[PDB]
């Protein structure tokens with residue numbers, strides 16, 4: 001069982017729909033998604049609408065989110081909910097009790113962390129009453145608020161982020177759903193970044209990744225290149241290598257076909273090739289495409305390509321990429337899991353299990369180049385850490401037979417941690 | 424006719440009521456206010472709820488502001504509406520298209536000023552449909568964002584603020600209502616500040632002031648002192664000193680009895696003394712107390728005294744200060760205007776009419792001290808600029824007979840531009 005779903009962008013209003021929900025349109029949105037053969041949706045409430053003061057939660061807003069989940073279920077979809085937005089498509093929505101005169105750190109100020117826990121437990125309790133509610137992700141790429149190049153960064157060490165995760169994630173746990181968090185790919189490509197690969201592959205229930213080829217992959221290897229279409233698979237192999245549990249699932253929680261680096265006509269093939277190659281990771285649990293519906297052209301200041309990331313267009317009509325993704329779901333949702341891999345790329349790690357050189361793993365880095373060279377060569381390479389490579393019974397338990405080390409490392413030549421040159 | 428009203432703080436939910444309005448309790452709120460003898464309310468929508476995207480306005484939010492205006496009208500109240508909140512009681516509510524990765528200047532970016540005009544036009548066209556709609560203020564203390572000590576300031580020259588006010592106020596105009604803006608007292612007391620005394624007494628329909636004795640007046644002069652009780656009179660006399668039109672109305676649009684500097688059982692006396700001296704200003708058009716209802720105790724991070732600024736308690740019960748203000752309205756709403764004033768303090772002004780030394784105007788500066796000495800000695804001083812003072816024709820026209828200049832000037836020894844030490 002391989003899951004196929006979409007990140008749900010309301011067709012009428014986007015995430016501004018929460019201010020005045022058109023429930024007939026939301027219902028129609030999810031009926032279309034379900035008829036495409038999807039089995040789940042990811043849902044994005046707005047934090048400052050849920051919690052506009054630190055000690056006052058908007059109860060109509062919480063019931064709004066529950067209703068969206070319920071309508072989803074009515075159409076046979078599972079629903080996954082992100083809480084701390086927070087960051088969406090280059091916009092930050094932040095509570096006024098955390099900015100300007102009330103500027104604070106959502107990761108390190110105990111007051112904030114206490115209000116965050118209260119909102120998550122409120123969300124979790126009320127949503128668990130819905131059967132369609134299948135998981136809680138703490139927020140969307142919450143790590144982007146924690147380091148450069150964020151212009152109003154809320155700094156923290158990796159040990160403080162450790163405690164932040166340990167404080168929030170139990171509050172989201174519960175019978176019948178997953179507890180998760182999500183990060184952008186700075187977690188693996190940026191040295192000194194306080195969100196770390198070990199956290200991503202040990203805390204919460206699955207290893208969660210977002211695959212975006214506008215981060216240098218497409219510009220550096222080539223939009224139509226095989227490296228470019230192999231990249232979601234590389235991110236999945238990379239992210240799972242840093243867990244103690246070799247079988248921990250990976251959620252390809254975001255993948256899209258960004259038209260600032262791909263040409264429009266190529267996005268259906270990019271979709272088919274990217275998803276086909278991604279399923280060659282036996283740890284892959286699900287694929288969630290970004291996104292269900294185009295962003296209304298009447299809303300400005302988005303980087304232009306965000307308006308056309310939908311599987312459905314501005315009129316709500318199914319696009320070629322949507323037909324492709326729906327055909328993928330019908331072809332692979334019952335496929336057997338990929339065969340194990342016997343060739344491995346070895347990444348050196350500190351005592352804690354985190355990469356000694358994170359810059360080498362990004363687009364155009366020595367590790368990424370090495371994995372791609374083997375992948376294009378047909379070797380089906382997997383990825384392990386130096387702690388595993390040193391242990392012969394650990395190697396034999398995984399069936400590894402051929403090791404490739406990064407002998408002459410260099411930093412990622414292609415990487416850029418920002419979605420549009422304007423930031 | 425002297426107008427008596429309140430800044431309306433919804434008893435249930437404060438301005439988070441917009442996210443989930445209890446319309447019955449809002450009707451009860453405005454019924455109380457009407458029964459107390461008030462003839463108008465001032466109301467505060469939230470900017471990022473009205474305009475979450477630069478080119479996308481939330482029609483339901485606009486409709487709810489209309490519904491609020493309409494409900495005030497049902498109880499014989501006139502309704503004045505601020506648009507750009509913006510700033511409310513130490514919190515900033517800012518659109519996500521002006522912050523972090525979309526950090527902009529709301530005074531100088533043509534795109535932002537165009538979106539601002541479109542919101543004003545929309546609000547004006549729609550609220551104009553209610554007869555109870557009598558005036559539009561661009562926003563509450565919009566100057567606070569333009570200069571130190573704001574941690575994320577959108578800076579500007581006074582010329583650009585001329586341009587900003589001029590680009591916005593025509594759009595707010597219309598038969599049957601006023602067009603205004605509002606500032607905090609830094610406009611008169613901070614040197615270099617780009618919102619100026621000349622703007623305040625020339626642009627829009629009346630000179631708008633907010634009178635808060637926690638700015639140093641109470642601490643420096645004494646909470647119970649003749650000085651402190653006379654401060655709102657000082658601010659009305661001072662603000663109109665800088666206009667071309669000696670008859671231009673002054674609206675005392677905010678005055679509260681802050682319990683961080685006043686004793687609780689003193690606030691009714693302070694209210695009586697403040698209003699009785701305020702109406703000694705011929706130009707005074709109305710007195711709008713801050714505020715109607717207590718800030719719910721369950722909401723945190725307010726400066727503590729802000730919680731008890733209501734005329735009614737949280738449970739909706741009239742407080743002693745409220746009883747007092749209601750009788751002040753009965754007492755004065757029909758009184759003959761104040762007698763003219765023959766004794767004047769002269770302020771030296773530059774070529775355009777703004778004060779050469781603004782720091783001398785604040786609590787405990789030389790000009791404030793000089794005006795207070797004459798006010799306390801029973802000499803009822805008014806205030807003029809050096810340009811009027813050097814013109815025997817202008818002086819005769821005002822009927823001024825005796826002039827008092829600032830011989831040895833000095834900066835305001837008491838002034839603090841924030842409402843809580845924590846800022």
Ligand SMILES: CC(=O)N[C@@H]1[C@@H](O)[C@H](O)[C@@H](CO)O[C@H]1O
Nearest residue numbers: 089090184210212417418419524
């Ligand atoms: C300000 C900015 O660039 N934000 C983008 C965000 O929109 C996107 O979701 C993410 C991809 O994982 O990359 C970030 O850099």
Ligand SMILES: CC(=O)N[C@@H]1[C@@H](O)[C@H](O)[C@@H](CO)O[C@H]1O
Nearest residue numbers: 512513607635840841842843846
């Ligand atoms: C940061 C801060 O304290 N801002 C306050 C504001 O809340 C208040 O409305 C105003 C009164 O004039 O005084 C400002 O200094």
